[PDB]
């Protein structure tokens, strides 16, 4: 379900587009190359896609790129000493909510939520939610934040 989750929260684009800083990206936020040259961007695509390298990709192609990025996210999570123990103590639904957060704010952002992180490792889920909501994150993207917290509180997909 993780693929549909990020897709509601971030969006899906099937052709090459340029981000606010101007690099070339595709899928659920997959950066190809920072070069201003599209050729290098498209070719970086050809190797991953293993097909005719074109601007448009299949929805299926999106999920393999997405999956590659999900590996990279878990690899970062395991390297961080504050993130690794909470991830190992968590079920599969709650792990996705952590990965969701890493997609949005990076590994360094999540490590700052020190109290909520211990509440989660102690399965004190009601208190984790109050701590998470008292943040600037909650105020800047509230509807996404309410979904991710809800997943933490109940361990279900019910919100997405």
């Amino acid at each position: 379900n993780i693929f549909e989750m990020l897709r509601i929260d971030e969006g899906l684009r099937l052709k090459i587009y340029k981000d606010t800083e101007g690099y070339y990206t595709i899928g659920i936020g997959h950066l190809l190359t920072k070069s201003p040259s599209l050729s290098v961007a498209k070719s970086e695509l050809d190797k991953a896609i293993g097909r005719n390298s074109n601007g448009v990709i299949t929805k299926d192609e999106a999920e393999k790129l997405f999956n590659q990025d999900v590996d990279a996210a878990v690899r970062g999570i395991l390297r961080n000493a504050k993130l690794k123990p909470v991830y190992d103590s968590l079920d599969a639904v709650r792990r996705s909510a952590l990965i969701n957060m890493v997609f949005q704010m990076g590994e360094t952002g999540v490590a700052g939520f020190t109290n909520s992180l211990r509440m989660l490792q102690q399965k004190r889920w009601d208190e984790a939610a109050v701590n998470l909501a008292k943040s600037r994150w909650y105020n800047q993207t509230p509807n996404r934040a309410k979904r991710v917290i809800a997943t933490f509180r109940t361990g279900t997909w019910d919100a997405y």
């Binding site: 993780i2 999920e63 279900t156 997909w157 019910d158």
Partner: protein, 263 residues
């Protein structure tokens, strides 16, 4: 003469069919209602999968319920008056008939998506397909009834009018697409996912078996409508009895189908 005795014999056999049809509809309505309350009681109601089962069951309860009121429009006096509530009851019944098709289509959309893309928000797509798309089709059919066939409470059958195609052709199309879905699910499950043991995979295989069981059971009655069997007394008695059993127990079959999948 004895022709009259032949006519009296037919009425008795038609009257037996009517008891088959009423009793079947009563049993089916009760079975669906029990399944509905069981689905709602469980905390698994918040899964997208159970939301779809619950709406499907609800759709069948309304159709089976309005079938009784339709019976009160089949009096010859009412059939010919074409009064307003006459036509409203027929149109509500066709609408529910159409929702039944689109909700069975919705189930096929879920099973195809579940095995290919890894709940309360996504449901709106299925509610809009199951409940919302049929409404304008029925309105369009109604405008066509109002304008080319305003007779017999819109339940008339006359050769050369194709108004009912407005709603019947959409029905056939979603069944065509559901057959394409079933071939890909079977192909996907047989080639890839042959060794897969994910929860979605086990449930998908349970679905494919049940769907294969149900497809013959529901299909005979749809073809039997086109049979035009004949005047053999033995052929007539069984044809009418067997078909009445099959149409009237359809809701019961769908309620076993949904409960089984819940496991």
């Amino acid at each position: 003469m004895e022709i009259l005795n032949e006519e009296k014999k037919s009425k008795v056999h038609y009257h037996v069919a009517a008891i088959i049809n009423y009793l079947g509809h009563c049993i089916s309505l009760v079975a669906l209602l029990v399944a509905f309350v069981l689905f709602l009681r469980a905390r698994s109601i918040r899964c997208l999968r159970n939301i779809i089962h619950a709406n499907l069951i609800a759709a069948f309860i309304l159709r089976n319920a309005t079938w009784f009121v339709v019976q009160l429009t089949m009096s010859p006096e009412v059939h010919q008056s074409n009064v307003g509530w006459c036509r409203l009851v027929t149109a509500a019944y066709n609408y529910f008939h159409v929702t039944n098709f689109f909700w069975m289509f919705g189930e096929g959309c879920y099973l195809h998506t579940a095995i290919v893309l890894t709940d309360r928000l996504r449901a709106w797509m299925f509610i809009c397909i199951g409940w919302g798309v049929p409404f304008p089709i029925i309105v369009a059919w109604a405008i066509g009834k109002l304008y080319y066939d305003n007779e017999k409470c819109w339940a008339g059958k006359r050769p050369g009018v194709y108004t009912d195609y407005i709603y019947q052709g959409p029905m056939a199309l979603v069944l065509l697409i559901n057959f394409i879905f079933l071939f890909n699910i079977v192909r996907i499950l047989m080639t890839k996912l042959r060794a897969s043991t994910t929860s979605e995979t086990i449930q998908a295989r349970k679905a494919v078996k049940a769907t294969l069981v149900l497809l013959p059971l529901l299909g005979i009655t749809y073809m039997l409508a086109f049979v035009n069997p004949g005047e053999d007394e033995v052929s007539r008695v069984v044809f009418i009895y067997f078909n009445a059993f099959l149409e009237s127990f359809q809701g019961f079959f769908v309620s076993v189908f949904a409960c089984f999948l819940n496991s």
